[PDB]
Amino acid sequence: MKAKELREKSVEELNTELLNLLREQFNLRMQAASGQLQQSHLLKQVRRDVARVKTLLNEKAGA
Amino acid sequence: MIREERLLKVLRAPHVSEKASTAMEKSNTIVLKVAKDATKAEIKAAVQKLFEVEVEVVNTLVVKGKVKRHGQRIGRRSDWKKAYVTLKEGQNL
Amino acid sequence: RPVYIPRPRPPHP
Amino acid sequence: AAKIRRDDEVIVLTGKDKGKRGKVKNVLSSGKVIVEGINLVKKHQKPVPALNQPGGIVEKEAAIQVSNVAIFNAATGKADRVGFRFEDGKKVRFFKSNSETI
Amino acid sequence: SRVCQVTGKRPVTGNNRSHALNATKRRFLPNLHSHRFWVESEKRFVTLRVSAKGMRVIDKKGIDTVLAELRARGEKY
Amino acid sequence: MKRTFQPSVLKRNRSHGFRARMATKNGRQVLARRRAKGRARLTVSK
RNA sequence: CGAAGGUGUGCUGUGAGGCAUGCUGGAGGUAUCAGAAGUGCGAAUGCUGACAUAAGUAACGAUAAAGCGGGUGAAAAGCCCGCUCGCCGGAAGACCAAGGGUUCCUGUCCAACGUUAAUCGGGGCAGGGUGAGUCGACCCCUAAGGCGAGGCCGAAAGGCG
RNA sequence: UAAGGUGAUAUGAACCGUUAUAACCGGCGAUUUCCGAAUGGGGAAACCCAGUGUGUUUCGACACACUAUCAUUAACUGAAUCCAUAGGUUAAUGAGGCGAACCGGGGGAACUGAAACAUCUAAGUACCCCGAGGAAAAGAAAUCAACCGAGAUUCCCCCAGUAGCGGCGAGCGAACGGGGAGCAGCCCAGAGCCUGAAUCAGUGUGUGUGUUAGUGGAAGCGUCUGGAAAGGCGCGCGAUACAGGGUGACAGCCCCGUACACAAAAAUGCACAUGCUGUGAGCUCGAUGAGUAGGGCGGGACACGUGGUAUCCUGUCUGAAUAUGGGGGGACCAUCCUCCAAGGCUAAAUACUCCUGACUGACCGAUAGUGAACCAGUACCGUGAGGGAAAGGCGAAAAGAAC
């Protein structure tokens, strides 16, 4: 899940980041606070995924 | 433009308590946790978009973390900000 | 530990 | 470069029951391994009102130093050491004293 | 400070000895004065805090030469 | 019996505060000494 | 099949000491001959820790004051409720600023803390609680005063403005 | 590298991975909030308030970038007066702050000693300030010597508690010369002939070596005591590996290591060869450092306290010759000998360790050793600078005592 998205264009990279932030990051957080989340390992996994996308954007845009 | 992602990070979690429950059933207002800065405008926009509800006004306050005496050591909790959001006649959550 | 916000809150007399 | 692995049948050289055979289940970062029916401890498990109520006395497995267990040859009927050699570009373990690959 | 702008003379500490050879710290000060020198190259007066020895130096050499050395020194005059 | 210490946050900060020390070189040496000693509190912080 | 250390006993040398051993101890010790010393403590109103004495003595912090019934509890003079009594009332009431920094409220516990007991508490643990266009800060303006581009002065630091 | 992992107190819950993108280690990258030289302005440090320029969902409002001071350079503007200068704006370059000691320079004590005390000593010490480096400073004779000779500076052992200085008291204390470590000499004050002509500094390439991850690494069994043996007893094997650490009592042969032999995609220091850039070889002639040397006055430094006092530096006032000239050779003069000041550059031997790795100890073993073996410069005390503790040990394994 690192080189799969390396070759995509910047437009899709921004799109996938938005849905990563939108869903599975905000929704998971609300679920965990309310106590309805039992698989807490998704939170860390989603956070790392967001970091991966941002790393690609910087090495794509500008430099 | 990072307004969309900003709105996705200001909200942290809902607040559950007796005061929260009575406020919801009586004043039709939701109390929830927000980021440390979380200006009133950002909270208002975030609730309108993420929760797809109409809001009237937002009141915010900062809660100071308590000092706890854990084991042989003294510690302090982190300050957090809670906001009261007053929904209009139409409420969803 | 250290609190740094001794802001004034004067209730109207 | 660990001589004792997840799935190995080993024997005990020194301890409460030397010469007893078994199979390792896990290895700890502190050079300790867990085997079946070798080092049994009658732990007094307290009762808890949570979902689990074991109570009574539980016969648990106690970890033993990896140095006290040697992989069994299974052919010569005795304990034997482990060495590493490179074959077809891969590092593999082998016995000694007529060494064969594992 | 009491520093000549030409020769660089600055106050120097020393002792003063009485008849009984008692030694007390003193300070020797250069004979500084403020003087206006006329420069024909630039056609105006330049004020320098120069010592009496420095004024003799200016007379012996040219005012233009001294100014050039001051400029090379890197201090505005 | 009025005692010597009469607390006042404004006077304490303006007298022994971090910015007061940095104003003069002597205060800067005070901070330098306390950094060397490893003190957790460099100065009286509000 | 038991080292050092600890604790008794019995022998031994004119002495500081040595030897053997009972019990505890639990893994180190060291002959002889030489070598080097942070090499020997009863005192220094010695230093640190521990423990005695006075002694179960003085004291328990304003002489405004308590009494009873019921409740809870293992236990009630002190906690809760009720009825009386007494005290302050330009305060011992109600508000702030400064200063404290959760001491606020609820549930629960009584080890330590409370100069006594304690079910009680400003004590322990957990949870909850601080909502502003109009209050204040922030912000605009300035006093004493501070800092101070250039500048003046000063061995350097720096002083004054 | 890998069959294990998601740092610790500290278990749990929910999961990843097991033949390769789980985790871990190393190189090179990305992100890097706010305070702090803090640098857009301000400020009670981690806060408040802006201007301009770039792009965008309801005008709403957002995102990014820039905007300190000083020095130098260039451009454009620009007074009192024509010109001009001062001044102003803009752009580029450099600096700012911190850091244990060592180095150079600018200032500079007192206690104390002299059995008092003032010269003197302590002492150019403590301390304050400035500047730079990995070292710094000094350094190629206007030096010594003795009329015999050596040839930059620096450091160590002698000379030597010697000669001298000294209320000739207390004390201070050389040089010449000798033995060692290490050695390197140059450039400008200027023209001509010849002009990459050696040596240097900065950027590419290639070899070797080293650092930043690592890999393999020999050889033991049976009985006795025992909670457990690595111990006793008996018989074996390895050693270019019995250095260490761990393992239920003391292990060369159980484990990690050790001697030994190997390893680098990428980044790097060192020594060479090969390219580019910039100053620059060699010969002839000439020149060869002036408010300086020296002197008067007042001080300081040389072991040398003004004494018969040479030599050097300087505050003040004066002031040559310039190579047929000048300096020194311890008052001074003559004769001889030696050198050529008033302009600069220069590694080596030398000093120290905030920090990194390995190794060692007739060093300590918890009132010792760093104040700190235990999240200590903490708790605590003080307005503040500052001061500053106590506290280690279950067991082989929690098997930490169900009932």
CSV table of N, CA, C and O in Angstrom, one decimal, chain F residues 1 12 14 21 26-27 31-32 34 39:
chain,number,residue,atom,x,y,z
F,1,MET,N,0.7,41.6,61.6
F,1,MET,CA,2.2,41.7,61.2
F,1,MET,C,2.4,41.5,59.7
F,1,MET,O,2.4,40.3,59.2
F,12,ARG,N,6.5,40.4,40.0
F,12,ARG,CA,7.4,39.2,39.9
F,12,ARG,C,7.9,39.0,38.5
F,12,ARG,O,9.1,38.8,38.3
F,14,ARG,N,8.0,41.2,35.9
F,14,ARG,CA,8.7,42.4,35.4
F,14,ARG,C,10.1,42.5,36.1
F,14,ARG,O,10.9,43.3,35.6
F,21,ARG,N,15.6,39.1,32.4
F,21,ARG,CA,17.0,38.6,32.4
F,21,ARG,C,17.7,38.9,31.0
F,21,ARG,O,18.9,39.2,31.0
F,26,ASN,N,24.2,40.7,32.3
F,26,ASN,CA,24.3,40.0,33.5
F,26,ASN,C,23.2,39.0,33.7
F,26,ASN,O,23.4,37.9,34.1
F,27,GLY,N,22.0,39.4,33.3
F,27,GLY,CA,20.9,38.4,33.3
F,27,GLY,C,21.1,37.3,32.3
F,27,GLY,O,20.7,36.1,32.6
F,31,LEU,N,21.0,33.2,33.2
F,31,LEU,CA,20.4,32.1,32.4
F,31,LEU,C,21.4,31.1,32.0
F,31,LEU,O,21.2,29.9,32.0
F,32,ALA,N,22.6,31.6,31.5
F,32,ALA,CA,23.6,30.7,31.0
F,32,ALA,C,24.1,29.8,32.2
F,32,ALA,O,24.3,28.6,32.0
F,34,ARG,N,22.3,28.8,34.8
F,34,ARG,CA,21.3,27.9,35.2
F,34,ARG,C,21.0,26.8,34.2
F,34,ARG,O,20.6,25.7,34.5
F,39,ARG,N,19.0,23.3,35.6
F,39,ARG,CA,17.8,23.5,36.4
F,39,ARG,C,16.6,23.5,35.4
F,39,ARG,O,16.6,24.0,34.3
